[PDB]
């Protein structure tokens, strides 16, 4: 995608060399922002084939508030496998915070249900937010949230969303995360009877891993193609009732996928 | 400042006309990002006179974990007065969250002490963050946080900081908030023996209130002056021991103050 390809190139040209906790190096920058007008097409990177299948199952798993990978396993999604414990648990990562943020008095807060009621009853609210950054539960998580907080906004019947991504693997994670949130916006817009607006992506520590440089050079020699179009084939009863077969991507014509370690 | 006037101009050229929570109309954009290299100068708006006095007191108060206006009111800082209850309490706003975020198991997390230790011992960490966005306590606060979350970053011996401001009053709030965080970056950097890098500002709902329009256009007819320079006179034993008198601004030569209703 043009903005994506400019970000890759910016890391290459201005990133500084760092070490990470794994001893693998990176090139990184701090602070970046991109905007995707979702009416221009679904923002799925076309300079490498990206499979939506795992993206879609993970989003639906998040919305059910499940943090055990059994559901992912039933549908052959393995992106979370290395962080799960012997029981398949991740601790209270994304899903748990989205649907049942734990309060000190034993109660839970459903942030998605709050956001839907804010979109439907108070769309101009300036606090239509979902945070996964539960400071009190970071030590229990298998991984601290990378797509840490997001905010919705309504203008002229269009639903926009901005994501603050505190840590971004530009090659591997970013195309996946852009798609995931673009999808959620389409689903929310549909449940609130709104049109789709912008997906604003803001990065904190934004990097390219050292072992992703050949792959990055390959990707930057390719030209982007027109974006595909998302089709939701069935409008369910609520935001918690989507199924994998409700989504279709049309006109997706990417270059061959690029594998990365 | 250049970045600040460019944002005002973007809100006027692109913003959507809507209404705030109390009706008071707004022009708003969604999503913005700007950067201030702190080595170029302390980012205190010059196109209207801004008083650093109150910004300093507020930050020293936040850093103590205080949420009662008494310290502010004694020092003639009245910006939080309208939100305070009859006992001067604001609820567990900013400072409480920063210094003692309450966990489910009964612990409290001191996010400022954590970030200081992560800057001294693991400066390349990708989670050197402070969040005031405590979902479980938002409705106990007098106001939900507007400068909601911030992250630090270290490169080439310089400390940078990015703030996510979910709701931004561009004319009244923003000049204050930029100066507040640039001061925090300076304090933290001093404490970790680092040099200052960039303050990165990101906005969510970024608006101009309709009754600030003539003031905004007035300000937009002026040229930004050279940035003032911040002199910290002492190196306290910790980030929690700074005093009002440790801070001096030099070379501040602003255009006239422009009053406006909150
Ligand atoms: S800061 C990145 C840390 N890793 C993650 O959070 C992983 C765990 C599985 C989901 N995410 S991801 O960054 O969205 C991702 C998705 C797909 C691949 C191939 C890698 C990483
Ligand atoms: S989203 C803005 C909501 N209002 C506030 O949080 C106020 C209360 C006092 C501090 N803040 S402020 O926006 O930083 C501010 C500071 C100074 C003035 C003159 C107005 C507002």
From Swiss-Prot, chain A:
Catalysis: reaction(s): dUMP + (6R)-5,10-methylene-5,6,7,8-tetrahydrofolate = 7,8-dihydrofolate + dTMP
UniProt subcellular location: Cytoplasm
One Pfam family hit: Thymidylat_synt
Metabolic or biological pathway, per its Swiss-Prot or TrEMBL entry: Pyrimidine metabolism; dTTP biosynthesis
EC number: 2.1.1.45
InterPro entries: Thymidate_synth/dCMP_Mease (IPR045097), Thymidate_synth/dCMP_Mease_dom (IPR023451), Thymidate_synth/dCMP_Mease_sf (IPR036926), Thymidylate_synthase (IPR000398), Thymidylate_synthase_AS (IPR020940)
GO molecular function, one term: thymidylate synthase activity
Post-translational modification comment from the UniProt entry: Although not discussed in the published references, Met-1 is represented in the submitted PDB entries as being modified by either a formyl, or a carboxyl group. The N-terminal is probably N-(dihydroxymethyl)methionine, the hydrated form of N-formylmethionine.
Keywords annotated in UniProt: Cytoplasm, Formylation, Methyltransferase, Nucleotide biosynthesis, Repressor, RNA-binding, Transferase, Translation regulation
Annotated binding of (6R)-5,10-methylene-5,6,7,8-tetrahydrofolate, by residue: 51, 169
Residues given in the record as dUMP binding sites: 21, 126-127, 166-169, 177, 207-209
SUPFAM superfamilies: Thymidylate synthase/dCMP hydroxymethylase (SSF55831)
Keyword Repressor: yes
Source superkingdom: Bacteria
Catalytic residue list: 146 (nucleophile)
GO biological process: dTMP biosynthetic process; dTTP biosynthetic process; methylation; regulation of translation; response to radiation
Bilayer-spanning residue ranges: none
Primary localisation category: cytoplasm
Function, in words: Catalyzes the reductive methylation of 2'-deoxyuridine-5'-monophosphate (dUMP) to 2'-deoxythymidine-5'-monophosphate (dTMP) while utilizing 5,10-methylenetetrahydrofolate (mTHF) as the methyl donor and reductant in the reaction, yielding dihydrofolate (DHF) as a by-product. This enzymatic reaction provides an intracellular de novo source of dTMP, an essential precursor for DNA biosynthesis. This protein also binds to its mRNA thus repressing its own translation.
Subunit comment: Homodimer.
Family assignment from sequence similarity: Belongs to the thymidylate synthase family. Bacterial-type ThyA subfamily.
This protein's name: Thymidylate synthase
UniProt lineage: Bacteria, Pseudomonadati, Pseudomonadota, Gammaproteobacteria, Enterobacterales
């Amino acid at each position: 995608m043009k903005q994506y390809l400019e970000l890759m190139q910016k890391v290459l040209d201005e990133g500084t060399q760092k070490n990470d906790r794994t001893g693998t190096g990176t090139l990184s920058i701090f602070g970046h922002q991109m905007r995707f007008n979702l009416q221009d097409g679904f923002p799925l990177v076309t300079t490498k084939r990206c499979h939506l299948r795992s993206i879609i199952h993970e989003l639906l798993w998040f919305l059910q508030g499940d943090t055990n990978i059994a559901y992912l396993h039933e549908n052959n999604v393995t992106i979370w496998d290395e962080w799960a414990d012997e029981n398949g648990d991740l601790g209270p990562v994304y899903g748990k915070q989205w649907r049942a943020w734990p309060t000190p008095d034993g109660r839970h807060i459903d942030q998605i249900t709050t956001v839907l009621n804010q979109l439907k009853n108070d769309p101009d609210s300036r606090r239509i937010i979902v945070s996964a950054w539960n400071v009190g539960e970071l030590d229990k998580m298998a991984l601290a949230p990378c797509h840490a907080f997001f905010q919705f906004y309504v203008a002229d019947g269009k639903l926009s969303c901005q994501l603050y991504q505190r840590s971004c693997d530009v090659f591997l994670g970013l195309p996946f995360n852009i798609a995931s949130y673009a999808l959620l916006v389409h689903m929310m817009a549909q449940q609130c009877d709104l049109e789709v607006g912008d997906f604003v992506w803001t990065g904190g520590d934004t990097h390219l891993y050292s072992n992703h440089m050949d792959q990055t050079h390959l990707q930057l020699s390719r030209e982007p193609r027109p974006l595909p179009k998302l089709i939701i084939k069935r409008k369910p009863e609520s935001i918690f009732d989507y199924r994998f077969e409700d989504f279709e991507i049309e006109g997706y014509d990417p270059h061959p996928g690029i594998k990365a370690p």
